[PDB]
Amino acid sequence: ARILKGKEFHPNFDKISFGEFLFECCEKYADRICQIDGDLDKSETYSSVKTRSTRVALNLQKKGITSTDVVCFCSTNSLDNSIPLIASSYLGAKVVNLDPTLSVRNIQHLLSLVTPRIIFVEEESLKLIEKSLKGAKLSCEIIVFGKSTKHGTFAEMTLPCGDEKAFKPSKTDIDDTAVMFFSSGTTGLPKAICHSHRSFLQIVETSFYCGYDCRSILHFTTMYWITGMAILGRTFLDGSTRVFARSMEGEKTLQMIEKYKLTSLFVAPIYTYQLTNVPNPERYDLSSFRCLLTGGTPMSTDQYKKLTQLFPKAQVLFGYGMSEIGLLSIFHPEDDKHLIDTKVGSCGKVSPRTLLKIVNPDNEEIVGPNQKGELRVKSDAMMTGYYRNDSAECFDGDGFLKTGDIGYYDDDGCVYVIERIKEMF
């Protein structure tokens, strides 16, 4: 019986705000490509992103936004959707994303949790947001990504004014909340998961030391999901390029890998079947591709194998994580290269600077390998708590996060998740 412990690293982003992080990354990697819209074939540099976000921030400041405010976003991925998020982060404000595919009743509840001062919304989700605010009986400024007479527009927020040259992100308390997500326990309604500047930056930094290639990474998930936000943070960290597309299609994804020379892609297992059913894949030059990132539901060994055949120069990395703490287990590309072709279907090994234990609930004691129990985890990437609710029971007597998952580990420390505990809040 032991506690699995990931490899050490020296944190470099543990003394600053998330806004200062993003700002510094922009300066460092100014001439590199920050983001590419795979659908429209448009791109933008870190330099340009810095300019537009600085202008949005200065305007947000004039509207009275400070670090205590929550700024909300409801939009699919575009070249604009992250700009006001970055801008809001410069001011130390709390940022949170809503899923445009959620019902009015679900959005209403989410808004009631975080009661935002401003919400940026895509044109397609404007009625949804208007209806939800009306239902929740909440007042909130709406700013549209597009045209509006009734509400303000994103284009207005990018209007240059003020001392752009002198602007610096606000000094703030790095243990204050920087980013929020929403819980999904097996019972009870969602709650607002709070990450501090420190905790979120450790989600990002821990993912970097997992060692996987992100130089040019494609994804489809919106910023509602931890993966969306974590990928953005991770690409900023070393001046890599984030690529997005609205919908996953097999053919178009292979075309994008060829067209942009992608090194990586994140997507849930079930969509990978669209890749493996593309006929005559050899007609695409996929030689740039190094890493298919996946997880969240189980992947069959045959599909796993088919994927390695489709991408012969790549590794397939199936990981495990959650909104409350980021990435928890995954195989290191080089250090675990041998096991990546052997030990399917595990979730990999524990991530750097992370502790993972399996606990027998009755008796409440940690167990050895090949003994199933409740997965519990602990690291500096852990959420600080809920925004207005009580996360006390999410953590055990030793301060470990209860994942709500049942699993076990190997003699070689490979992790296996098998099921969720029923009716856990």
Which residues bind to Cl ion, rule: CB under 5 A?
Answer: 113, 191-192, 386-389
Nearer to Cl ion, 48 or 389 (CB): 389
- Please answer whether residues 327 and 351 qualify as being in contact, where contact means their C-beta atoms are separated by less than 8 angstroms: yes
Comparison of 352 and 385: residue with beta carbon closer to Cl ion = 385
Smallest distance, Cl ion to C-beta of residue 191, A: 4
Pairing of strands 373-378, 401-409: antiparallel
Q: Which residue number, 50 or 191, has a Cβ lying nearer to Cl ion? A: 191
CB of 112 to Cl ion, least distance (A): 10
Q: Of the two residues 274 and 389, which places its CB atom closer to Cl ion in the complex? A: 389
Rg (CA), the chain: 21
> What is the residue whose two structure tokens read 């004691």?
365
In whole angstroms, how close is the CB of 37 to Cl ion at the nearest point? 33
Q: How far is the CB of 424 from Cl ion (least distance, A)?
A: 17
- CA distance readout (Å), 132 to 102, 104, 108, 345: 11, 5, 5, 42
Nearer to Cl ion, 180 or 316 (CB): 180
- How far CA 63 is from CA of 26, 55, 66, 74, 91, in Å, comes to 24, 13, 9, 20, 12
Cβ distance to Cl ion smaller for residue 195 or 234: 195
**In 197-350, where do the E strands start and end?**
216-219, 241-244, 264-266, 291-295, 315-322, 326-330, 349-350
Least distance (Å) between residue 367 CB and Cl ion: 33
Select 190 or 250, whichever has its Cβ closest to Cl ion.
Answer: 190
Nearest CB to Cl ion, comparing residues 70 and 85: 70
- What's the closest the beta carbon of residue 383 comes to Cl ion, in angstroms? 11
- Which strands make up the sheet holding 192-196, listed edge to edge? 152-153, 141-145, 118-122, 70-74, 94-97, 177-182, 192-196, 385-386
* 191 CB-near residues (< 8 Å, 6+ apart): 113, 182, 183, 386, 387, 389, 391
Contacts of 120 (CB under 8 A, 6+ apart): 71, 72, 73, 74, 75, 81, 84, 85, 143, 144, 145, 154
The 10 Å Cβ neighbour count of residue 337 is 11
Instruction: Output 116 or 352, the one with its CB closest to Cl ion.
Output: 116
Q: Which amino acid does the sequence have at 131? A: K
User: What DSSP line would sit under 393-425, residue for residue?
Assistant: GGB-TTSPEEEEEEEEE-TT--EEEEEEPTT--
For the bound state, the minimum distance from the C-beta of residue 115 to Cl ion, rounded and expressed in Å, comes to: 11
- Please report how close the Cβ of residue 97 comes to Cl ion at its closest, in angstroms: 15
Give me the least distance between CB of 314 and Cl ion, in Å please.
40
Q: Say which amino acid occupies 111.
A: L
User: How many CA atoms are closer than 13 Å to the CA of 207, on its beta-carbon side?
Assistant: 30
